[PDB]
Write a protein that binds this ligand. Structure first.
Ligand SMILES: Cc1cc2nc3c(=O)[nH]c(=O)nc-3n(C[C@H](O)[C@H](O)[C@H](O)COP(=O)(O)O)c2cc1C
Length: 146
């Protein structure tokens, strides 16, 4: 009910945008597709760090890769198990990248999720990474003047 989707959030891809200037680098935008994937309402996740997607089978070494990328303000692509609101597991081929302003300073982080039933390799991995990187570039363009 609360927090009607902006045009940005109706882009037909799973993504979130966080603002590292708020304590705990919380979600400020979340696509309709992301909400369908994860089963949360937008009001339930705005202002929260994305770590709520993690659960018991999530590989914590992989989460550390993401933590390190955020702290060093660089991109990363990983695969990890995430959980919906109701506890359904999915593999997440995940890409993070910072969005920089006109002075090169990081203003937001963009995260793109490609959900699947399995850890992917070879062609499926390559095509997945192609898709989430292109999507991240599209969101970078969309978010530039937010
Ligand atoms: C833009 C953005 C999107 C993120 N999306 C996911 C996600 O899809 N799945 C996930 O497990 N973590 C995601 N994270 C990572 C967590 O929010 C967090 O950075 C990670 O758990 C490491 O920090 P922590 O050790 O304090 O939990 C995302 C982070 C950011 C900045």
């Amino acid at each position: 009910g609360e927090f009607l989707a902006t045009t940005l959030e109706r882009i037909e891809k799973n993504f979130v945008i966080t603002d590292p200037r708020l304590p705990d680098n919380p979600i400020i935008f979340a696509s309709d597709s992301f909400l369908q994937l994860t089963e949360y309402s937008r009001e339930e996740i705005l202002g929260r760090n994305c770590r709520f997607l993690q659960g018991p089978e999530t590989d914590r070494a992989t989460v550390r890769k993401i933590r390190d990328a955020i702290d060093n303000q660089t991109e990363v692509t990983v695969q990890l198990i995430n959980y919906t609101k109701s506890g359904k597991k999915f593999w997440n081929l995940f890409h993070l990248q910072p969005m920089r302003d006109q002075k090169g300073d990081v203003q937001y982080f963009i995260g793109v999720q490609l959900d699947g039933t399995e850890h992917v390799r070879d062609a499926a991995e390559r095509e997945g990474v192609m898709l989430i990187k292109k999507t991240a570039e599209n969101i970078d363009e969309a978010a530039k003047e937010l």
